[PDB]
Amino acid sequence: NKVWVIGDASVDLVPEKQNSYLKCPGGASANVGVCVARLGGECGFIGCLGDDDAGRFLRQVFQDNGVDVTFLRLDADLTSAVLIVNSFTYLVHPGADTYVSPQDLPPFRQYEWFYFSSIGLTDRPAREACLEGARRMREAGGYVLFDVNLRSKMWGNTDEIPELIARSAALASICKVSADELCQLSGASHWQDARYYLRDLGCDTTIISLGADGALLITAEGEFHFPAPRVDVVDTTGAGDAFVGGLLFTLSRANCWDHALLAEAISNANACGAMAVTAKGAMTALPFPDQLNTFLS
Amino acid sequence: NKVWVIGDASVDLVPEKQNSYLKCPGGASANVGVCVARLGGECGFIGCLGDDDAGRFLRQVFQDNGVDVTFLRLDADLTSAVLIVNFTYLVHPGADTYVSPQDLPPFRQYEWFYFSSIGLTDRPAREACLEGARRMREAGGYVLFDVNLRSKMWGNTDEIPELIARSAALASICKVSADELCQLSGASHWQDARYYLRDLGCDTTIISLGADGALLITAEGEFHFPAPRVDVVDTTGAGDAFVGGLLFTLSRANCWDHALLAEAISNANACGAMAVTAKMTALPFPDQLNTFLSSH
Numbered sequence: 001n002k003v004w005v006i007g008d009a010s011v012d013l014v015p016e017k018q019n020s021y022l023k024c025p026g027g028a029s030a031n032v033g034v035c036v037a038r039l040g041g042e043c044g045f046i047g048c049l050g051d052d053d054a055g056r057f058l059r060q061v062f063q064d065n066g067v068d069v070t071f072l073r074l075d076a077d078l079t080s081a082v083l084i085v086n087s088f089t090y091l092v093h094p095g096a097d098t099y100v101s102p103q104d105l106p107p108f109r110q111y112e113w114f115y116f117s118s119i120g121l122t123d124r125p126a127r128e129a130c131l132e133g134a135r136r137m138r139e140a141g142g143y144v145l146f147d148v149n150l151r152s153k154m155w156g157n158t159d160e161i162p163e164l165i166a167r168s169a170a171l172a173s174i175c176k177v178s179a180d181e182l183c184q185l186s187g188a189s190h191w192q193d194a195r196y197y198l199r200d201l202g203c204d205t206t207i208i209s210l211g212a213d214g215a216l217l218i219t220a221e222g223e224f225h226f227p228a229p230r231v232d233v234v235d236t237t238g239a240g241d242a243f244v245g246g247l248l249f250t251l252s253r254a255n256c257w258d259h260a261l262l263a264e265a266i267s268n269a270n271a272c273g274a275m276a277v278t279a280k281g282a283m284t285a286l287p288f289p290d291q292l293n294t295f296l297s
Numbered sequence: 298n299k300v301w302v303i304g305d306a307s308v309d310l311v312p313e314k315q316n317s318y319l320k321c322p323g324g325a326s327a328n329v330g331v332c333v334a335r336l337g338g339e340c341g342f343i344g345c346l347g348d349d350d351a352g353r354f355l356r357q358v359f360q361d362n363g364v365d366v367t368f369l370r371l372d373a374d375l376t377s378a379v380l381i382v383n384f385t386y387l388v389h390p391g392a393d394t395y396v397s398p399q400d401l402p403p404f405r406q407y408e409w410f411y412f413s414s415i416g417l418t419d420r421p422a423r424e425a426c427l428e429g430a431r432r433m434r435e436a437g438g439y440v441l442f443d444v445n446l447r448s449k450m451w452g453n454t455d456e457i458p459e460l461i462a463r464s465a466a467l468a469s470i471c472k473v474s475a476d477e478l479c480q481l482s483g484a485s486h487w488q489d490a491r492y493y494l495r496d497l498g499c500d501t502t503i504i505s506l507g508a509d510g511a512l513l514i515t516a517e518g519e520f521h522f523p524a525p526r527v528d529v530v531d532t533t534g535a536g537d538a539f540v541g542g543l544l545f546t547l548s549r550a551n552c553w554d555h556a557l558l559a560e561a562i563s564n565a566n567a568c569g570a571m572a573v574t575a576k577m578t579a580l581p582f583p584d585q586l587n588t589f590l591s592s593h
């Protein structure tokens with residue numbers, strides 16, 4: 001089954017010396033799409049980008065990775081995002097990725113997956129596109145994966161976040177969150193004191209990440225933990241996207257899913273989450289089918 | 298006497314190796330400040346930049362060159378400009394654009410204040426510039442208006458003719474380019490337009506001609522200063538280098554007279570060439586300037 005990712009794609013400039021930036025492809029939604037594609041899965045990107053430099057560059061990157069771009073439109077009246085890893089400093093104000101809208105949605109099919117995060121929720125056009133997209137995917141008999149990739153500093157009135165988060169866990173088949181983001185949401189200092197936070201918001205399945213520590217699967221059979229490989233950081237950029245990437249690649253192999261698949265899924269997550277940190281780009285060390293096993297064992 | 302430059306400070310991204318850009322210091326007001334500094338003059342930058350990588354990067358370049366940054370304010374809610382060439386922009390609010398009148402320092406007799414239309418395009422910056430010129434004049438100081446016309450960057454191209462004239466009014470000396478004259482006057486030949494600013498209140502005008510040097514317009518008449526012979530390869534930042542060397546001279550005294558004004562333009566043409574011949578950055582140090590003024 002096909003995995004549809006909707007959201008941001010951008011150029012990330014990460015330093016090296018005391019006078020230069022390394023140009024890498026990026027965007028939470030882009031990283032995830034390229035991750036799922038590289039693992040041999042079938043993935044499609046739904047979004048907007050300007051018909052500019054950054055636009056065509058990132059577009060090309062999708063093609064070189066096997067990511068369907070039929071529904072990725074490039075508007076010349078727009079400018080594609082560019083940030084600088086220093087921990088992010090965004091440069092483009094409205095950000096082309098925020099212009100995607102319900103018209104840009106592809107017809108959905110049974111058992112397919114729809115992915116989106118709060119980043120897709122910041123500005124209006126996109127916001128509608130995401131929530132409608134999830135609505136249609138569920139109506140089509142499909143699954144929605146909401147990654148509450150909380151980006152406080154990107155929002156205009158942080159007084160919309162708690163509300164849009166709840167309406168996503170609602171539509172969401174599976175919600176993925178980080179230890180930090182839970183605390184930062186529940187207002188709690190100990191995530192564990194509020195780890196049924198999303199569940200009580202409408203989502204029955206939660207996958208809470210924990211760094212080089214792994215993840216915590218929270219369904220109803222109980223809380224299951226998974227270990228993260230021996231880390232050796234080089235650039236933490238995109239660990240989270242690689243994690244969700246491997247997660248969808250797996251879930252997408254079946255039509256239905258249970259703890260079983262949910263465990264092989266999270267194992268792939270923790271794995272793809274560790275590797276990616278080894279390189280210096282958000283999606284530089286995203287594994288191929290043959291590089292994943294060599295690292296696995 | 299100290300030279301105060303107010304305006305743009307941005308990080309220019311230039312292609313390089315493989316999918317890697319390199320930081321380049323830039324900004325008409327920045328280049329000038331660095332120019333004046335390098336030549337062993339006393340210069341201070343008044344402006345804004347984000348406290349982002351760039352913002353702090355630029356502050357460094359200013360320090361490594363002897364440019365006072367006491368009045369260079371680094372905000373957090375702002376974002377320093379960044380351009381990518383191959384000159385497409387990215388940051389539109391523009392941090393350097395948030396500089397305001399309360400970021401201005403105290404001026405003192407015989408000091409120079411510099412600014413261009415680039416500083417006049419967005420709001421806080423615009424007030425900051427006109428107020429800065431007003432104060433420097435009241436302090437018995439000097440103002441150098443460089444009508445560095447950037448039609449594109451301007452939102453309402455109608456505000457330009459008006460802001461240029463109000464500026465000429467405050468200026469002690471106005472610097473303009475041959476084409477810049479044609480743009481405002483609308484004439485094809487600039488000579489038919491050499492009094493455009495004169496009629497706007499500026500008694501002294503320096504019209505840059507590039508390779509042909511420079512024409513000076515004053516009450517007593519106009520005098521031509523030819524340019525040094527060089528292999529023209531890259532004209533970037535030539536204008537900033539020209540104005541930089543110009544301020545570095547007029548400051549070395551209290552009240553420029555026939556002779557100092559005469560030598561200032563020679564420094565300008567000079568500093569303006571080292572640019573077109575070499576690789577901004579083409580700014581020289583006193584040692585290199587001299588070895589050039591001669592056999593070079």
Ligand SMILES: [K+]
Nearest residue numbers: 170172202203
């Ligand atoms: K749900």
Ligand SMILES: [K+]
Nearest residue numbers: 235237281282
């Ligand atoms: K990385």
Ligand SMILES: [K+]
Nearest residue numbers: 465466468498
């Ligand atoms: K005047």
Ligand SMILES: [K+]
Nearest residue numbers: 531532533572
């Ligand atoms: K040049």
